[PDB]
Design a protein around this nucleic acid. Structure first.
Length: 187
DNA sequence: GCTATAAAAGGGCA
DNA sequence: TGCCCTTTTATAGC
């Protein structure tokens, strides 16, 4: 790892990317669910056609408005690439589908600092950013202000970082928390 | 399973 | 007017 961009020497692994795009045309969801083999639509439950492709492994929520949500990709490039594949399937179904305002909405990453954490203590010292009700959920919820990112910290040293729109925020949030985790290493 | 976290889309309903 | 709901993903105890 490049110790220069990642001083901790640990790089969060990207696990999930959520993006949206505007197909810029009205869609008939019922016609889509009927023609598209790997598409499901239950309006009484959710007003979107749920469609999935194997590569990049992702799930799309396609709306009558032409707007679309792409989930599951492991990278921003994979997410865009997936979003484009769905837009082409919709095109080939007979709709004038474009690709307007593609935007990465959320990036989820995770890593392991490989040492256990004293969550109770970190929670106490960082109360204005922490929520820890172990009887509820075993992880401590750390709502970082700069960058405005949320981290789920576990006793095992495993960390989840979410809420970023740019991978650098994921990286910086982790670099910010790293000395703090060290400060609260369980001995 | 399911507790919790982020985020987007849009229909239903209080 | 504005929350829930659906989907995804890592994490870990119920």
């Amino acid at each position: 790892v490049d110790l220069s961009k990642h001083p901790s020497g640990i790089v969060p692994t990207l696990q999930n990317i959520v993006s949206t795009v505007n197909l810029d045309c009205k869609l008939d969801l019922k016609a889509i669910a009927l023609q598209a083999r790997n598409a499901e639509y239950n309006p009484k439950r959710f007003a979107a056609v749920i469609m999935r492709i194997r590569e990049p492994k992702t799930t799309a929520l396609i709306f009558a408005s032409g707007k679309m949500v792409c989930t599951g990709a492991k990278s921003e490039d994979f997410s865009k690439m997936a979003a484009r594949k769905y837009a082409r399937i919709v095109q080939k179904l007979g709709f004038p589908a474009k690709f307007k305002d593609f935007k990465i909405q959320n990036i989820v990453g995770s890593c392991d600092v490989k040492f256990p954490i004293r969550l109770e203590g970190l929670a106490y010292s960082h109360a204005a950013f922490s929520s820890y009700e172990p009887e509820l959920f075993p992880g401590l919820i750390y709502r970082m202000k700069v960058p405005k990112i949320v981290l789920l910290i576990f006793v095992s040293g495993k960390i989840v970082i979410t809420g970023a729109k740019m991978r650098d925020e994921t990286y910086k949030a982790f670099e910010n928390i790293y000395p703090v985790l060290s400060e609260f290493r369980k001995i």
